[PDB]
From a paper:
Two mammalian homologs of systemic RNA interference defective protein 1 ([name]-1) ([name]/2) are suggested to function as double-stranded RNA (dsRNA) transporters for extracellular dsRNA uptake or for release of incorporated dsRNA from lysosome to cytoplasm. Here, we determine the cryo-electron microscopy structures of human [name], homodimer in a side-by-side arrangement, with two distinct conformations, the cholesterol-bound form and the unbound form. Our structures reveal that the membrane-spanning region of [name] harbors conserved histidine and aspartate residues coordinating to putative zinc ion, in a structurally similar manner to alkaline ceramidases or adiponectin receptors that require zinc for ceramidase activity. We identify that [name] has a ceramidase activity that is attenuated by cholesterol binding.
In the cholesterol-unbound form, the transmembrane region undergoes a large conformational change while the extracellular region is well fitted to that of the cholesterol-bound form structure (RMSD of 0.3 Å for Cα atoms). In the cholesterol-unbound form, TM5 rotates about 25° and its cytoplasmic side greatly moves from inside the membrane spanning region to the dimer interface (14 Å shift of the Cα atom of Thr592), which resulted in the interaction with TM2 of the other protomer. Interestingly, a tunnel is found to be formed in the transmembrane region in the cholesterol-unbound form structure by the conformational change in the transmembrane region. This tunnel is surrounded by TM4, TM5, TM9, TM10, and TM11 and penetrates the transmembrane region by passing through beside the zinc ion. TM8 is supposed to be located outside TM7 according to the weak density although TM8 is disordered in the cryo-EM map of the cholesterol-unbound form, which strongly indicates that TM8 do not intercept the tunnel.
Residue numbers in the entry:
A (entry chain C), B (entry chain A): 44 to 275, 287 to 335, 442 to 528, 541 to 592, 605 to 621, 626 to 651, 708 to 815
The structure:
């Protein structure tokens, strides 16, 4: 039967009859066209569904209406409206216009008869445009996919998908041109890069991965929200896809020089105040760096295999990146998260150089206190190193390594103190019970405030859970630095200007750094799709987000606070 | 057109014609029947394939002949013979016999005509039997699957699949009864437990996971061997599946008592030789166990998430178990690999008790050497602990943690020695270059023999890469123990019988343990399917394989060698 596009054909089919519709159209040698088939079925006899077969020249598609989805815990769903977009065949200049035939066979084995409505339309918005937002609606029975063609100048693009509602849970996938196109829930993650989303998604692609310099962007809606962060007629989802070009290679070399020349200006400070003085005229140390080298050896090998699993598969749900500001460089998918830790490592070498100069000049004056300062600058290096391997592929498992090492350092430091205790030990053991799981949480914060009071009093007599350590790192040291400002003012002592600049710089840097610490852009505490809802763009030279600025400012704030403790003893 | 089973129908189809065959049969209320459809296509015009649609009452299947597979690096394959087994509908006593209809629509859009051969048979060997080997042949275009029904007494089964040839690479999957059955390469790993095999495979199932107490065993042949350990008309594979019942709960409690009462008999030895004597009438220590606790904290959390990823998915290719002797217990998939390390931990507590008794009696005699012996017994505990967390889910990543810690211990021990060197340092750095990659390998073994000679000479003056450390652990200590046997014999010294029994027990235990060490049953150095080829059955009470016996004997051999070093100084 000859049939026309954009016309709703209705009919009744049963065991003896079988309706066959023939659709005839042509494809232009430059324009690319796609055909979408809509089938309805008002008959709710689930034992006798409507079987629809779509035949092309090189492909056959088949589905049953109403669609059935087997949910978890013995749940089933029906979908009376099923839609599908056929795989387009692109005509070139070498072939000219191409005539194409589509046969749509609608049949059923019902004894009485099943009603159905068939509508076949052409898609006028199949091809996506650069920097143009496109709005569309998808459904678990009605998947959608579109085509993007790479321009000649553009070498890498970012696909930004944004939705205003969290549910239903969706899947965005990028696939090749060659038919078939896997747009069903059981084969969408078979090949190509894919992501899971609730509100936001971001996929970064390169031109060299696709031989035709084009790809399909497949949008599949899941029938249940168990894979995302949730549970449980139609689950219609409104989406908005925008494809933007990535930054050029000049932004890479401009931001790399900013991350070096800022912290090399700190090296100019020591060589400038060392010129003022010209114008004014071990085994236990080596023991703490073999532990750090042998601790850091498996965690580099752990996250390298995490990165290569992501690269050779399409599973971008393993690493918890900030995908809106993840700029790749070769194997690394987020080079900006590694580059901002370079200044954190380097600045510790300046502090180790400063305490070396103080130790040699004290030993030279001895011819005519400095031990833990070496370990304080060593921990500045290794945490910047461990943050770099954490940011190769951030995950729930990798966070239990870069913080546990620092906890171990604190433990060994207490042993040295004891050489010249239980309330701090329950604190380490209460927080691992919260990993397992009203009575627990009222003492979870009660012992943390008591231990914060039990750190400040012992220093006074000597005169996530990592954020809770960082909570007391700001709170107790603010009073601990302020204890000798009022003690030296009351006694016969004066504050030199060189500590005075370092005290006021430590206060303003920790005020600025703690603001950027609370701007969480990702979280492994929930599902990977829930982590993507908090992603944000780059706010520094289109290369650094809020968390990468925190890596810069906490490097300065740790350095200036450590320089305060080296000073204030010149009287 | 009415058609009969077991008859090869041939025909020519083109654009105008479309052959439709109707197949009519009945299903018995106790016997379960399955229908297999074979389609050939001798026409090699790839632009106009033969499109076959199989319609049932509740399901529609469609495929094109010849089948096309898109390989890696732009490779394509054709398959002129395509076979498929339709999803069976089981008739019960409540429904009686059921009449069923199958329509097979064969069509093509070729202008001239395409030849095809259709054959539809019933399967007389669809249901599998317990403890009965079944032989069958599969192909990438001809997947096969069978049905197993759980007996009332059996609560858990093991599916043992064995093939005589490594290639082609195959996939074995276990799925639910409910249609559709995913037997294609793009959806076989969508749900249910699946495994990848080349020669052997073993899937362990429980009755409580399947609500119908039955399952489908799907066999899918991959078109390429890149997922397995290899590369690159038909790729026919001969397989053999046997379903065996698992061991009862009595074997669990019998083998658990064997692992305890053997090593508790070692505790009876100290309480027996302590009765003979009745008838004859710190801070640095605490520093080494906080490093071990903080090192062991993330690796338990690393492998627990590895186990839960395996459990909630079907991916059994992550953990490198010995699947022929992997006995689950709750969350753990291989409980026998955890249980054999219990005696390795416990036996170290006896050695720590022995050196405590020697230290107290020496201190009591002081009123009227023992430091590293505490650390030697501590490393006996922690390596048995670290082998247990390694065997929760063995992997390439987890091996770089349980060996690196021991390497770190050796490093810190050298610091104590230095307190009272470069050739040992290149050895640690050469072996990590072999992870990256003729000139390298001739010095890889040359520096290892030289360093083995450079360990023995320094002790003489005081009077995988983990297997290479274990290579010198046997070789250098054999001469190092033999150095004072000939020295005491030449000088005026006699060997007491209590060391003498311990020397001859150390030699026979290390001879027995090294035999079981070289029986490798798994290897993460290759693909997961290549690791499964070396799996073996349990050789000790149907609960312990060769590697679990190695955990028993090396625990005794380390204990008796450590007891030798405590003795031989009574003169
Ligand atoms: C496939 O064939 C078509 C048909 O010739 C090609 O389209 C043609 O492309 C050229 C190159 O850009 C166009 O010439 C340009 O025309 C504009 C005015 O439209 C003029 O301002 C430029 O200076 C230039 O001369 C040409 O107009 C265009 N033809 C049509 C009908 O639009 C197409 O490029 C071919 N594609 C491939 C991949 O070979
Ligand atoms: C299959 O059944 C569905 C659901 O009954 C049909 O979708 C419905 O289509 C009509 C006409 O396209 C929509 O009516 C229009 O709605 C808009 C927005 O409310 C309104 O501005 C218009 O004046 C008009 O009333 C209707 O909303 C829509 N229903 C839903 C739930 O989306 C569909 O057309 C049927 N046929 C096929 C081939 O899918
Ligand atoms: C579905 O209906 C069939 C038909 O009745 C049931 O098969 C029947 O099962 C009973 C129970 O085992 C059989 O009785 C046994 O017969 C053997 C001799 O064959 C005798 O030695 C035993 O002592 C016992 O009496 C009965 O023979 C068998 N009928 C036939 C025709 O084989 C079947 O159990 C029903 N299934 C369900 C799930 O209800
Ligand atoms: C589609 O084409 C294939 C391949 O041409 C056909 O398979 C062939 O089937 C014949 C008859 O079943 C087999 O011949 C028999 O071979 C055995 C073992 O060599 C021999 O003992 C017998 O005397 C007989 O000659 C033939 O081996 C087999 N070819 C292959 C490669 O397996 C198939 O029958 C065709 N039709 C369908 C519906 O699949
Ligand atoms: C449903 O099946 C019935 C028979 O099972 C068929 O009804 C026929 O409809 C055609 C025209 O639509 C006429 O020949 C008669 O009204 C019916 N013939 C017979 C022999 O029953 C038909 O296949 C289906 N009915 C529909 C679509 O209305
Ligand atoms: C699809 O429609 C086109 C018309 O748009 C048909 O093309 C016609 O074909 C006949 C015979 O081949 C010619 O005599 C006409 O001149 C063609 N029309 C045009 C506008 O070129 C085409 O045949 C149709 N497809 C099928 C399968 O019938
Ligand atoms: C291939 O297509 C041709 C037409 O394109 C058809 O050949 C017809 O075959 C039938 C019987 O097989 C007879 O009516 C004539 O021999 C042909 N008729 C016409 C109008 O050409 C047929 O569809 C196919 N040929 C086969 C299967 O042999
Ligand atoms: C499939 O075959 C069976 C026979 O094995 C057909 O059953 C017959 O149905 C007619 C009318 O319904 C009865 O008069 C006969 O007595 C039945 N035969 C038997 C042996 O019971 C059945 O109709 C066939 N299916 C179809 C769709 O025609
Ligand atoms: Zn960070
Ligand atoms: Zn082991």
């Amino acid at each position: 039967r000859g049939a026309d596009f954009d016309h709703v054909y209705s009919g009744v089919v049963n065991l003896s009859t079988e309706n066959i519709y023939s659709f005839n159209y042509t494809s232009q040698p430059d324009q690319v066209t796609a055909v979408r088939v809509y089938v309805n079925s008002s008959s709710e006899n689930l034992n006798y569904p409507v079987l629809v077969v779509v035949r092309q020249q090189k492909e056959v598609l088949s589905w049953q209406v109403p669609l059935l989805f087997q949910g978890l815990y013995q749940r089933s769903y029906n979908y009376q409206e099923v839609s599908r977009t056929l795989c387009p065949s692109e005509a070139t200049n070498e072939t000219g216009p191409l005539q194409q035939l589509i046969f749509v066979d609608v049949a059923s084995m019902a004894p009485l008869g099943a009603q159905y409505k068939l509508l076949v339309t052409k898609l006028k918005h199949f091809q996506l445009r650069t920097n143009v937002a496109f709005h569309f609606t998808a459904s678990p029975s009605q998947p959608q996919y579109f085509l993007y063609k790479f321009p000649k100048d553009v070498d890498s693009v970012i696909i930004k998908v944004v939705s205003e509602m969290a549910y239903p849970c969706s899947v965005v996938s990028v696939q090749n041109i060659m038919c078939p196109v896997y747009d069903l829930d059981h084969n969408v993650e078979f090949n190509g890069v894919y992501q899971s989303m609730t509100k936001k998604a971001a996929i970064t692609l390169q031109k060299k991965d696709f031989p035709g310099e084009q790809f399909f962007v497949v949008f599949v809606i899941k029938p249940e929200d168990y894979a995302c962060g949730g549970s449980f007629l139609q689950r219609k989802k409104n989406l908005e896809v925008t494809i933007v070009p990535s930054i050029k290679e000049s932004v890479y070399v401009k931001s790399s020089l900013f991350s070096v020349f800022i912290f090399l200006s700190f090296y100019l400070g020591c060589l400038l105040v060392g010129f003022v003085h010209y114008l004014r005229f071990k085994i236990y140390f080596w023991n703490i760096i073999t532990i750090a080298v042998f601790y850091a050896l498996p965690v580099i090998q752990l996250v390298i295999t995490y990165q290569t699993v992501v690269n050779v598969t399409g599973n971008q749900d393993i690493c918890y990146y900030n995908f809106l500001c993840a700029h790749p460089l070769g194997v690394l998918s987020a080079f900006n998260n590694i580059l901002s830790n370079l200044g954190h490592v380097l600045l510790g070498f300046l502090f180790l150089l400063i305490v070396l100069r103080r130790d040699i000049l004290h030993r030279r004056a001895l011819e005519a206190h400095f031990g833990l300062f070496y370990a304080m600058g060593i921990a500045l290096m290794m945490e910047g190193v461990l943050s770099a391997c954490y940011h190769v592929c951030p995950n729930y498992s990798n966070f239990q390594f870069d913080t546990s090492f620092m906890y171990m350092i604190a433990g060994l430091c207490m042993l040295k103190l004891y050489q010249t205790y239980a309330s701090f030990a329950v604190v380490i053991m209460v927080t691992v019970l919260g990993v397992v799981f009203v009575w627990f949480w009222v003492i979870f914060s009660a012992i943390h405030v008591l231990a914060s009071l039990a750190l400040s009093t012992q220093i006074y007599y000597m005169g996530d859970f990592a954020s809770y350590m960082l909570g007391i790192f700001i709170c107790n040291l603010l009073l601990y630095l302020a204890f000798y400002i009022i003690m030296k003012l009351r006694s016969s002592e004066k504050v030199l200007p060189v500590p005075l600049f370092c005290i006021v710089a430590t206060a303003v840097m920790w005020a600025a750094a703690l603001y950027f610490f609370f701007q969480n852009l990702s979280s492994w505490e929930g599902t990977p799709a829930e982590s993507r809802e908090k992603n944000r763009e780059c706010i520094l030279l289109d290369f650094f987000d809020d968390h990468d600025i925190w890596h810069f400012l906490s490097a300065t704030a740790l350095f200036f606070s450590f320089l305060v403790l080296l000073t204030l003893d010149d009287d």
